[PDB]
Design a protein around this ligand. Structure first.
Ligand SMILES: [Cl-]
Ligand SMILES: [Cl-]
Lengths: 222, 222
């Protein structure tokens, strides 16, 4: 099971500067040496590289776009099969009620429990309605990952109104909640942990130097 | 000449997770895409990789330890010759009063002006008196890099007492001053720029995921 604490997301999609299974493995090493309790990573190849540098538990996804669907985080059983091959400890997937390319969400959850019975699952949700559905489905972890990153949550960011969205998720489910998406400072990490999340995912504020650089430059441009 | 704005330091010494000319070149590309106006980098191999990736001006150093000297930033003519070969726009060196392994500081400044007449020089100092000495020696830039990192500045850190050390350096010299060392947050960057530095170096807060991770974990351990 994931410990309480900091999960570092070590992702770099094609055309991002640090795109490389190799490079993400050394980023995960840095996160381990700095006190992370877990890693979140994208694609079987990055997961397998990370598993050669660190023994931290990994939350795996596969970001892959499909025609005629906006679902791109572990959309179908093809992505699930890649993640079962990766041997990541937690399989995360979009758990929105958006139209998927192939299996429905219920079917994908059933598929994972059948084919990978020793692997925990994490729901990436955008609304309280989705979070409560994920708890019904027996997800091990419910994350706020897609809040602000769907067409129906545009402009909403996790930290808005003193993390009201997170407070609403925590009140709505008894499952382990993960604060993920727009946790960008140590002060925000402390806030979400104080509100009672199991653990938090921090990505860009540690592993996207372009994103961090933009925050430094922007302070001079306000 | 260096512009005003943000210089991102892209360093990873041999024991660090990201040690790699290729990775530091991608850190530098990320910094460029985020709005940096220059790069600081360590070793000829890293600098050459960076300069083939981005056209930003580079402040070059060579960190190399020598017996019976506490000087390790561009300590001798060996390191200067490596930086001349690198074609970096600005050669930075320890500009402390500490005895060097080979050539004195004054010796190395004259050596750079005669062997690389088109290259600007940056003084990494620890004290106001070293800042004044570097102005005497005709440095183009004077940085606060070693303030708090010498045996005669122990316990001192740039940000202490609302950046009083920086205010004292700016009052003491007419040359372009660079805020470098312990510029940890966008708020610190804004403060030093508002106090009148030419530009500021930010390294580990952008390009050392281990140190950023450590800052997230620490907030929970206070
Ligand atoms: Cl990046
Ligand atoms: Cl690091």
């Amino acid at each position: 099971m994931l410990p309480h604490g900091l999960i570092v997301s070590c992702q770099a999609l094609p055309d991002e500067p640090l795109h490389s299974s190799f490079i993400m493995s050394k980023m995960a090493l840095a996160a381990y040496e700095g006190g992370a309790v877990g890693i979140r990573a994208n694609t079987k190849e990055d997961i397998l590289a990370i598993k050669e540098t660190v023994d931290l538990p990994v939350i795996g996804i596969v970001k892959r776009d499909y025609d005629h669907s906006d679902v791109f985080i572990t959309a179908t059983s093809k992505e699930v099969d890649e993640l079962i091959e990766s041997q990541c400890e937690v399989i995360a997937l979009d758990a929105t009620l958006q139209q998927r390319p192939k299996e429905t969400l219920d079917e994908l959850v059933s598929y994972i429990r059948t084919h990978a019975p020793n692997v925990e699952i994490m729901a990436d949700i955008a609304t309280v309605e989705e979070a409560k559905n994920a708890a019904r489905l027996g997800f091990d972890y419910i994350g706020t990952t897609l809040h602000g990153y769907t067409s129906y949550t545009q402009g909403q960011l996790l930290y808005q109104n003193d993390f009201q969205f997170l407070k609403d998720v925590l009140q709505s489910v008894d499952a382990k909640v993960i604060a993920a998406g727009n946790v960008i400072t140590p002060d925000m990490y402390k806030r979400v942990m104080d509100l009672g999340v199991h653990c938090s995912v921090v990505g860009g504020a540690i592993t996207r130097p372009k994103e961090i650089t933009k925050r430094f430059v922007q302070i001079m441009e306000d």
